[PDB]
Amino acid sequence: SINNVNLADGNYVVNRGDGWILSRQNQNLGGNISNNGCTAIVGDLRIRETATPYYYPTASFNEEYIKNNVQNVFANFTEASEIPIGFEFSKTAPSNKSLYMYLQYTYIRYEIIKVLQNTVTERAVLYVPSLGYVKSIEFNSEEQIDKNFYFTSQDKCILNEKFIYKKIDD
Amino acid sequence: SINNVNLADGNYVVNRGDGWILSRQNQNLGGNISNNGCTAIVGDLRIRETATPYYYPTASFNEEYIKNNVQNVFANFTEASEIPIGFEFSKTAPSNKSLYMYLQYTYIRYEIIKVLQNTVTERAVLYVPSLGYVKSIEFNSEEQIDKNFYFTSQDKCILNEKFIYKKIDD
Amino acid sequence: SINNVNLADGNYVVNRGDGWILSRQNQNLGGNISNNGCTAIVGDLRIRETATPYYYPTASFNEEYIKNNVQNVFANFTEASEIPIGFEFSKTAPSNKSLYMYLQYTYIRYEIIKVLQNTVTERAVLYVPSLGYVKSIEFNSEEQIDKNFYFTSQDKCILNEKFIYKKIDD
Amino acid sequence: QTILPYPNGLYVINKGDGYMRTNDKDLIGTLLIESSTSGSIIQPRLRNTTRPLFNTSNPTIFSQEYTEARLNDAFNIQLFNTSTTLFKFVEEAPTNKNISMKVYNTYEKYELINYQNGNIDDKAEYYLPSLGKCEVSDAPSPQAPVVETPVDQDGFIQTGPNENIIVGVINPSENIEEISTPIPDDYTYNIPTSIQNNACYVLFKVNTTGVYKITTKNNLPPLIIYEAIGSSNRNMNSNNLSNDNIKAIKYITGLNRSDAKSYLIVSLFKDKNYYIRIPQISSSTTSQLIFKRELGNISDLADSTVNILDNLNTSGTHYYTRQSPDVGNYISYQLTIPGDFNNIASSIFSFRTRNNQGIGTLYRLTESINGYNLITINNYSDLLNNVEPISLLNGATYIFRVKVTELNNYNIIFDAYRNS
Amino acid sequence: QTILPYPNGLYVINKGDGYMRTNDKDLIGTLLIESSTSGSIIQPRLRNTTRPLFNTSNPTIFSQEYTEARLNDAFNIQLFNTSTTLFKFVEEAPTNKNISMKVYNTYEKYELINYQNGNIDDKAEYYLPSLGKCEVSDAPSPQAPVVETPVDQDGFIQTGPNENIIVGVINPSENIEEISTPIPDDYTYNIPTSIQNNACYVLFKVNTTGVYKITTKNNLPPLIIYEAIGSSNRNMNSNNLSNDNIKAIKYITGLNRSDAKSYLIVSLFKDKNYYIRIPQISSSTTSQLIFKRELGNISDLADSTVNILDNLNTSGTHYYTRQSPDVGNYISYQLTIPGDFNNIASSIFSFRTRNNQGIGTLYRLTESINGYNLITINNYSDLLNNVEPISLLNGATYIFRVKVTELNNYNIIFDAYRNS
Amino acid sequence: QTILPYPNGLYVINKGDGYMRTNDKDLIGTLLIESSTSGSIIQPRLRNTTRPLFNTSNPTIFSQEYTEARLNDAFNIQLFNTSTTLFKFVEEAPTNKNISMKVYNTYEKYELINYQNGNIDDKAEYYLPSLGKCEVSDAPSPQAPVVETPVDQDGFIQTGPNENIIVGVINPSENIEEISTPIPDDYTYNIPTSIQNNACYVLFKVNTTGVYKITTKNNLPPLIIYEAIGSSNRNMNSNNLSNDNIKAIKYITGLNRSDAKSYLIVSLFKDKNYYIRIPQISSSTTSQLIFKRELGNISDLADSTVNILDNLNTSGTHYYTRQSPDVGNYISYQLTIPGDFNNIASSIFSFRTRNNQGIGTLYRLTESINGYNLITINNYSDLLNNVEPISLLNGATYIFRVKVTELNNYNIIFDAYRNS
Ligand SMILES: CC(=O)N[C@@H]1[C@@H](O)[C@H](O[C@@H]2O[C@H](CO[C@]3(C(=O)O)C[C@H](O)[C@@H](NC(C)=O)[C@H]([C@H](O)[C@H](O)CO)O3)[C@H](O)[C@H](O)[C@H]2O)[C@@H](CO)O[C@H]1O
Ligand SMILES: CC(=O)N[C@@H]1[C@@H](O)[C@H](O[C@@H]2O[C@H](CO[C@]3(C(=O)O)C[C@H](O)[C@@H](NC(C)=O)[C@H]([C@H](O)[C@H](O)CO)O3)[C@H](O)[C@H](O)[C@H]2O)[C@@H](CO)O[C@H]1O
Ligand SMILES: CC(=O)N[C@@H]1[C@@H](O)[C@H](O[C@@H]2O[C@H](CO[C@]3(C(=O)O)C[C@H](O)[C@@H](NC(C)=O)[C@H]([C@H](O)[C@H](O)CO)O3)[C@H](O)[C@H](O)[C@H]2O)[C@@H](CO)O[C@H]1O
């Protein structure tokens, strides 16, 4: 399945791409409501104090091993976290209806994989806070909304996934 | 006159509405001048340090009595005052003329009334800092301006006044 | 040449105008790159800590002499420097090309001149930090750019130069 | 250099917004905005400090601190040297040209004056930091030939719209007395002994809206009445006067002139608060303030000071110099014709004014068990040049009302010419 | 006041956004925006402090701190009383009219419940500070006649879109056991002695995706299985189970009912983690958890609890009360017909349900050296009113599957009517 | 890997903006902006800290601190690791599609080099934090098939427009001397003894704009002259040289080559400041710097080094290797023809160059009581392949000027071929 890689045997650090949203964290930051042509704006600052990484280590790859190997090949997120960065989204509510939009953090998914016989044997995962993403829907207090709009049961990428690797040495 | 209320005998706390500007305080924050299609913007932050309430107590109703009875039924302004809130207004000056706009704070008018024989016998008043309102006029150094534009002699509501009550107990 | 003035003999303080950019400091603050209809924005705050004056004294006119005589007739920049002021520029990148814009500080050029026989004998110069100015150019990694776009070898005024004087007394 | 139709006292004049100094002393900066680009200048208040400008003719008394307190009484200004109010300007240059954006700090000019007998004895100018000015125009050519120009004269110029708003304030050195209970149809107030030491103000409100006659028992000294600006519709008690420490006062009517024997006829509303200023009484005999609600068309004297004329038993001119009301306002004169009453007997009179022009109305004052009553005898569309005489019954009383139409002088002179 | 088709335990319900109190208690302010002008209200977070609202039916256990921890297990919420998230509204008034802009603070309502046997024993409501609401409309006339209006009832109203998202969380007072090695086709797990003291959860994953039969050696007590929401595609090891402390669980199938002798048939994916909750076993004899990967069309029972029916050797009604699956989900029943097997011999049965409606499928359970196999005997489009009887071979085993189509009651009653 | 036509010394090269590392090491983030929505990424400078990148071939001398000081001399950069300059990008997605907004931090690449005899002996690369890059495009499909891709090579790539701006700086280890008084038409300066220990620069300005001849009394050693970039129109005194510590220098003309006997002919403007760099003189006899304002068409040699040719009394090739001027610039050669003067007597010559191509102008140097004068004898549109010989009077002096048109090598070789 997702464990089949055309890669030589060894350990690799992989950049799975930017744009990853996490399972069921959809509405953790709250939502915004507007109407009748009003412009709604939501934004945030990924200050080092809030933007915290999510580590999912394995036996072969511990937190430290994952961090150093990622910050060695890809963007050094520990350094960058000291400099506040902002982002915002804005949208105009329809003329005679209501608009609801909610915000959630996006991430860069990094992976540390152990390959054997062209198959992934072990997989560590790291989610580095990137920016944010908003979802909006128009409504009225009667409308029924699809719950997939409010909930994400499995981690996924809102952009196209990626597989940019580099074999680890020693 | 304004003391005739179709209300049972007793004491009441009344929400007179948002949008109240105070007597002769019109130009206390200063004015702004622009021209030839330029966009002018004025805004403010009702920080707890500036936004101070105006109490007008009576014999039956003192400052404390007024506050607790208002914050009990309506918005608790003492709590909210700890969280900075902003507002702004913007307007484009005419192509070949000047634009002048000035800002002033708006308020929510609360009242504590004593009723007897369907008439107000005693009336305490409280003005809670709300947001702001701007007034603009186009001009040239020759034009004569109506002084009502610059001055408000009697407290009034720029929105429609209100009378939302609740009888006080004990 | 530039030393011929139709002025009585004596010392004068002159306002040479706002809008002066300094020699080769063009790209000291960095540049910005955007494309495909994106709007790019660059701005700054001339905080007292950064906005520092450039003095060019002579024998007759020392730093102190220049400052007091300027702040006496014209804007007192030492006082004003305590109040942060901002400015920004924005521009939309072309639909199918790239946009590059860079920022640099502008200044007010003041002069202290010694006149003898309708000619300037001595000239002190002061540059007071004013605001900023951006330059932009559209491009593609192949295009060749005129180096005058990136470099200013001699101090100049992006606006029309001025000569507003006042004879110094005692 | 114009007539200020107000009684003696303190005044705060908002002289307008957009004031700034000459020679770019308030210039924040200029932006050269090239075509298809947008430029912006901002006062973000990263620091809330502002720098007011002050000038006074008397540092000892009209100090900056004193002046600020007055501005607080007049307009209730809270912050004088700080601000959280942001202002910002934005401009987009067209596709064909470059734009020049100049932005300056500005000030609102407040004038504090000590006005005495048609004259300004002291003056202070307070420049309240405002929200700036922005001038955009076609960018000048960098090649434009430089013209030597002498610096302008040191000073201020006004950039905002024309404005002149006068607001009087309670003289802080004269005490305030208060009549706690809303006054009924009739009320007498004994003036405290402190009156011997300085003028005072008497704060009060009426229980019933209507017209009132207010005076001292001998019609001396002259009184002045003000309205407490903003006093209406705030805290209220039917049995007590709720004070709001409103020190901003609007002059209704009254004179300062010592010998002006008189009484006041004014319209009073129960939802408002008023101040009567009693001059200093250098006497040991207690004076009184009498209030009387008048029913009837005496209300026609709608906010006026009624001057009682003296020495009418002679022939010729009979002049009376009084501080002139403003254009549109009144000033009245009461006349009891010399001689005994017997319908028939009369005397010829010719009413005129000398400094200011106005419209006159002659009333016959009558009595009734329903109060007083006025009977219009005649009207005059020109008082400065009136020649039309008129005969008045001896021993009868007449009231002449003047509505000022032209304010040429601080004082308006009334002439009750007796032809016979 | 509606049926909640879930087993006993804890649940966190996101009841929606846009909640606010009555009587403008959450009103931030109103702006009067005149024609050709733009207005804006902002929550800039110059202070990151927010004020959550909390209500609980049991302060001792369902405290605010406790509730917050549950919300963290359900949705992984990090910040409860602070925020760096800015929200702002902007509106431009048309050239013809004035606009009114009202802005309010809002909350997302999270409900924490202790659900026991179709009943809520404890409840807490946590109002998470949200990103506000903005109402723009035509500015009201300042002259509009004021109408006396009594204050509304104290409380909340919902302003956002309709939302009801249920998420179960591991009961924090029941311990978690872990089967470290991915289970193969067959696996037996000895239940620890702690089971005598309280229920526990067994965390595990399968080495091969497919359908599995899970049960205790005597089909007692009944088991319940959950999925660890978000557990798929994270850290992974082929020889070990990587835990993510995911306490958010999605109910697959299972019952709480004590006497419900049964086993589970479920679809399991190797990339996910699961939890089996074993009730408290008040016995000194060690129980076991047996896992068996089933090959064959037994998969037809796709995520179902198979109830083994008892006392079938009588005539008439044979009722079985069980917690009803949700609309669209299954609940199965295994039947071994009384009597000895000899193809020919049979008995007449009539299958029905009583509280809830559904679609029935009758299967003949057979044997093979390739595992089990099902043979569809008949289908029923109506179980509440089914009258069509059917004859079943004695000594043979049948499985009846019910797909709920109408959830009228917490429990669904199954009736295996024996006509002969 | 290209020819750098400059004398020995230090140089700071602005190599352009938009530099960033590979493998998204400078990626700030990506926004998915859905149709009819607007997205924005901001660097608000809530913290003014920036992180410069530095690389050097010699840490001991070309340290980061040293390099920064050079960058300050070249472009006067003040802040290296802090910034108050905000940058922000905004994009609105059309109604039909989604947009992807990627934003990266960037750097301006400044190269510091120690250039010696056509070679770089030391090099440092300073990456000044810049104002970012934004890439917007059609949002990619979340379904797009993932392609395994090997990480790129560690390094930088340029994203901004092409730029290469060279600025020379005073060598900080060679002292600066100053001729305080603006030099008149004739001036002699005695070179200090420190010249025995290291090269120095002599700062000065001329009292009168015009062309000047500058040299040592024996035309040895060769001199080099620079312009102090930005020195014009700042502070000025008619009797004194006002220094601005401008360490940024623009090479006018001059050579490093030891045996290059010569003098300089340059155009000097009184409103500017200049630097003459005198090589180290390892001798105990005092040298001198002579300045002479030349009137006449000698100005034709407009900014050139005039090399005096030696050993012309033989037949065949007469080569002269000198550092080549840049395309468009000059390099001259003075020739006194061997033999005695008597109009008639002559010798045949053929002028050529060998490495670089250019345009030649042959002048006959004459004398007058009004200074020197040149008479154009001939012009050559091709020097690399010139074969056209020419006869020159013996005992007469000629000057050949070369305007480089093609820069193929660091050195340009001149050949004064004597056919007879
Ligand atoms: C503020 C104050 O106290 N008032 C000062 C005046 O009192 C002062 O002038 C006063 O003038 C008095 C005489 O003036 C007339 C007048 O009104 O012009 C002269 C008239 O003939 C007389 N009318 C008749 C027919 O009797 C008129 C009248 O008696 C009074 O108005 C009372 O009804 O008085 C007198 O000489 C005072 O001694 C004198 O102070 C003026 C300066 O002239 O300054 C005011 O501030
Ligand atoms: C949570 C829990 O422990 N369950 C509680 C129930 O046990 C309790 O009701 C139980 O009812 C039992 C008898 O009920 C039936 C039934 O299912 O309705 C009666 C049927 O006739 C019988 N079926 C036949 C033909 O034998 C059926 C069957 O034996 C069982 O379902 C097992 O297959 O039982 C008995 O009286 C228990 O003592 C009693 O607890 C209910 C309340 O009624 O609450 C549940 O929470
Ligand atoms: C930086 C420095 O000091 N210069 C170094 C050179 O000196 C050095 O090469 C020098 O070459 C000298 C001889 O070269 C020629 C030449 O210019 O090519 C040979 C010519 O025939 C001769 N011209 C004639 C007709 O006499 C010519 C001429 O004498 C001189 O240019 C002076 O006018 O010299 C000599 O061998 C030196 O000893 C030698 O240093 C080069 C390396 O070749 O490096 C430079 O950096």
For B46-80, the three-class secondary structure string (H helix, E strand, C coil) is CCCCCCCCEEECCCCCCHHHHHHHHHHHCCCHHHH
Could you tell me the resolution of this structure in angstroms?
2.6
Question: How, if at all, do strands E319-323 and E411-418 pair?
Answer: antiparallel
Query: Chain C: residue nearest F138 by CA?
Result: C36
Q: Contact at 8 Å (CB) between E263 and E306?
A: yes
Q: Identify the H or E element spanning F350.
A: strand F346-353
Distance CA D269, CA D207 (A): 9
Q: D298 and D315 in one domain?
A: no
F178 and F134 fall within a common domain: no
Pocket of ligand 1 contains residue D259 by CB under 6 Å: yes
Residues C123, F160: C-beta atoms closer than 8 Å? no
Residues in contact with F63: Cβ distance below 8 Å, sequence separation at least 6, in sequence order: F56
Most F-contacting residue of C32, C126, C152 (CB-CB within 10 A), to test interface? C32
**CATH number for position F220:** 2.60.120.1080
**Tokens 């924040």 label which residue?**
D28
How many CB atoms are located within 10 Å of the residue D379 CB? Answer: 10
Chains in contact with F, where contact requires at least 3 CB pairs less than 8 Å apart: A, C
Lookup: tokens for E405: 């189509």
Locate tokens 């509501």: which residue? Answer: B157
Tell which of E263, E292, E310 closes a domain: E310
B42: nearest CB among D17, D76, D87: D87
Q: Is F378 in the pocket of ligand 3 (CB under 6 A)?
A: no
Is residue B97 within 8 A of residue B140, CB to CB? The reply is: yes
Dist CA D22 CA D104 (whole Å): 11
Picking from E45, E139, E131, E46, the residue whose alpha carbon sits closest to that of residue E91 is E139
Whether F contacts C, i.e. 3 or more CB pairs less than 8 A apart, is yes
Contact E79 A50 (CB under 8 A): yes
Contact of D217 with D287, CB cutoff 8 Å:
yes
For a ligand 1 pocket test, name from D117, D320, D324, D335 the mutation site with the most ligand atoms within 8 angstroms of its C-beta: D320
Out of A47, A75, A79, closest to residue F24 by CB: A75
One-letter-per-residue 3-state SS of D262-301: EEEEEEECCCCCEEEEECCCCCCCCCEEEEEEECCHHHHH
Q: Which residues contact B146 (CB under 8 A, 6 or more apart)?
A: none
CA separation (Å) from E98 to D336, E32, E136, E228, E260? Answer: 60, 7, 10, 53, 68
Please, which residues have CB within 8 angstroms of residue E392's CB and are 6 or more apart in sequence?
Answer: E335, E337, E346, E347, E348, E349, E398
Backbone angles phi, psi at C68, to 5 degrees: -60, -40
Other C-beta atoms lying within 10 Å of the C-beta of residue D328: 10
Distance from CA of E122 to the nearest CA of B (A): 28
Nearest-angstrom CA–CA distance, D61 and D70: 12
Tell how many helices (H) and how many strands (E) occur in chain A: 2, 9
A163: exposed, middle or buried (Cβ count in 10 Å: 0-12, 13-18, 19+): middle
- How far, in Å, is the centroid of ligand 1 from the Cα of B37? 59
Q: Which of C85, C111, C133, C169 to mutate to test the interface with D (most CBs of D within 10 A)?
A: C85
Last residue of a domain, one of F140, F174, F191: F140
User: How many beta carbons lie within 10 A of that of residue D280, not counting itself?
Assistant: 14
**E326 and E223 share a domain?**
no
Distance in Å, alpha carbon of D93 to nearest chain C alpha carbon: 10
- Best probe of the E interface among A4, A21, A29, by most E CBs < 10 A, is A29
> Which residue's C-alpha comes closest to atom 25 of ligand 3?
F318
Q: How many structural domains comprise chain A?
A: 1
The answer, for E31 touching chain B at a CB cutoff of 8 Å, is: yes
- F47: which chain A residues are within 8 Å (Cβ-Cβ)? 82-84
Find the helix or strand (DSSP H, E) in which D72 lies: helix D64-75
Query: What three-state secondary structure class fits D44?
Result: coil
E-assigned strand segments in F230-342: 236-237, 248-254, 262-268, 274-278, 288-294, 304-308, 319-323, 330-336
| Whether residues E368 and E382 fall in one domain | yes
- Distant-in-sequence, close-in-space partners of F343: CB < 8 Å, separation ≥ 6: F393
**E68 Cβ under 8 Å from any chain A Cβ:** no
Cα-to-centroid distance, D306 and ligand 1 (Å): 16
Within an 8 Å CB–CB cutoff, is residue E228 touching chain A?
A: no
Q: Is D254 left (phi over 0), alpha (psi -120 to 50) or beta?
A: left
Residues 6+ apart with CB under 8 A from B65: B57, B112, B124
What is the domain count for chain D? Answer: 3
Burial class (CB in 10 A: 0-12, 13-18, 19+), E321: middle
Distances (CA, A) of E269 to C53, E205, E206, E302, F356: 70, 8, 7, 13, 76
Query: Are D288 and D353 members of one domain?
Result: no
Q: Are residues E300 and E321 in the same domain?
A: no
Q: What are phi and psi of E300, to 5 degrees?
A: -55, -25
Whether F211 and F349 share a structural domain: no
E2 plus E136 within the same structural domain: yes
Q: Are residues D315 and D305 in the same domain?
A: no
D38 to C156: CB separation less than 8 angstroms, yes or no: no
d(Cα C105, Cα C103) in Å, to the nearest integer?
7
**Is residue D3 included in any domain, yes or no?**
yes
- Regarding the beta carbon of F418 and ligand 3, being less than 6 Å apart is answered no
Return phi, psi of residue F297, to 5°. Answer: -80, 20
CB of C67 closer than 8 Å to CB of C114: no
CATH at C40: 2.170.15.20
Q: Assess whether F166 and F306 both reside in one domain.
A: yes
Contact E298, E371 (CB under 8 A): yes
Contact A23, A151 (CB under 8 A): no
Q: Do chains D and E touch by CB distance (3+ pairs < 8 Å)?
A: no
Strand F176-178 to F200-204 pairing? parallel
Question: In this structure, is residue D46 part of a structural domain?
Answer: yes
Give CA–CA dist D95/D115, Å, rounded: 57
The half-sphere exposure of E190 on its side-chain side, counting CA atoms within 13 A, is: 5
Q: Are residues E116 and E250 in the same domain?
A: no
Tell me which residue has its CA closest to atom 39 in ligand 3: F259
On whether any CB of chain F is under 8 Å from the CB of A37, the answer is: no
Is the Cβ–Cβ distance between D377 and D362 less than 8 Å?
A: yes
CA gap F212, F267 in Å, rounded:
6
Chains F and A touch, using 3 or more CB pairs below 8 Å: yes
Task: Report how far residue F135's alpha carbon sits from residue F124's, in angstroms, rounded to the nearest whole number.
Answer: 30
B85: closest chain E residue by CA = E43
Test site for ligand 2: of E8, E256, E277, E321, most ligand atoms within 8 A of the Cβ: E321
Single-letter residue type at C100 = Y
Comparing CB atoms, the residue among E28, E47, E150 nearest residue B166 is: E150
Beta carbons within 8 Å of B158's beta carbon, 6+ residues apart: B19, B20, B21, B106, B133, E32, E142
Q: What is the DSSP letter of E325?
A: P
Mutate to test the pocket of ligand 3, among F319, F349, F352, F413 (most ligand atoms within 8 A of CB): F319
DSSP F324: P
Distance E261 CA to ligand 2 centre (A): 11
CATH number (domain holding residue E332) = 2.60.120.1090
Interface of B with E in 103-122 (CB under 8 A): 106
Ligand 1 centroid from CA E299, angstroms:
119
End-to-end CA distance of chain B: 28
**From the CA of F320, how far away is ligand 3's center (Å)?**
7
Enter the tokens of residue B162: 């209100």
Token pair 């000044």: residue: F128
Q: Where are the beta strands (DSSP E) in F99-237?
A: 99-104, 107-116, 119-129, 133-138, 148-150, 156-158, 165-169, 176-178, 186-190, 200-204, 210-215, 224-228, 236-237
Q: Which residues contact A114 (CB under 8 A, 6 or more apart)?
A: A10, A11, A60, A61, A120, A121, A122, A123
How big is the CA angle at E25 (ends E19 and E31), to the nearest 5 degrees?
Answer: 95
* Nearest CA among F127, F8, F15, F154 for reference residue F67: F127
**Min Cα–Cα distance to chain C from F157, Å:** 11
Same-domain check for residues F398 and F419: yes
Query: Quick one: which ligand is closest to E333's CA?
Result: 2
Q: Which residue range is the domain that position B113 belongs to?
A: 1-170
- Contact of F127 with F19, CB cutoff 8 Å: yes
Residues of B in contact with D233 (CB under 8 A): 2, 154-155
CB contact under 8 A, F33 and A89: yes
Q: Do B84 and E47 touch (CB under 8 A)?
A: yes
| First-to-last C-alpha distance (Å) of chain A | 28
Selected for mutation to probe chain B from E148, E153, E154 (highest B CB count within 10 Å) is E148
Output the CA E311–ligand 2 centroid distance in Å: 13
Which numbered atom of ligand 2 lies nearest the CA of E309?
Answer: 33
Tell me the HSE value of F255 on the side-chain side, using a 13 A CA sphere: 31
Ligand at minimal distance from the CA of D7 is: 1
Q: Which residues of F touch C36 (CB under 8 A)?
A: 136-137
**C-beta pairs of D244-248 under 8 Å, 24+ apart in sequence:** D244/B56, D244/D273, D246/D273, D247/D73, D247/D74, D247/D169, D247/D170, D247/D172, D248/B23, D248/B24, D248/D73, D248/D74, D248/D75, D248/D76, D248/D167, D248/D168, D248/D169
Full domain range(s) for residue D358: 311-420
For A91, the closest of F32, F36, F42 (CB atoms) is: F36
Decide if D147 touches C, using CB distance below 8 A.
yes
Q: Whose CA is nearest to atom 38 of ligand 3?
A: F259
DSSP string, B119-154: EEEEEEEEEEEEEEEEEEEEE-TT----TTTT---S
Q: Is the CB of D341 under 6 A from ligand 1?
A: no
Task: Answer whether E touches B (≥3 Cβ pairs < 8 Å).
Answer: yes
N- to C-terminal Cα distance for chain F?
A: 42
Q: Which of E280, E310, E340 delimits the end of a domain?
A: E310
> Phi then psi for D298, rounded to 5 degrees?
-75, -15
Taking the centre of ligand 1 as the mean of its atom positions, its distance from the CA of residue D259, in whole angstroms, is 7
**Of E296, E335, E334, E338, residue with least CA distance to E313:** E338
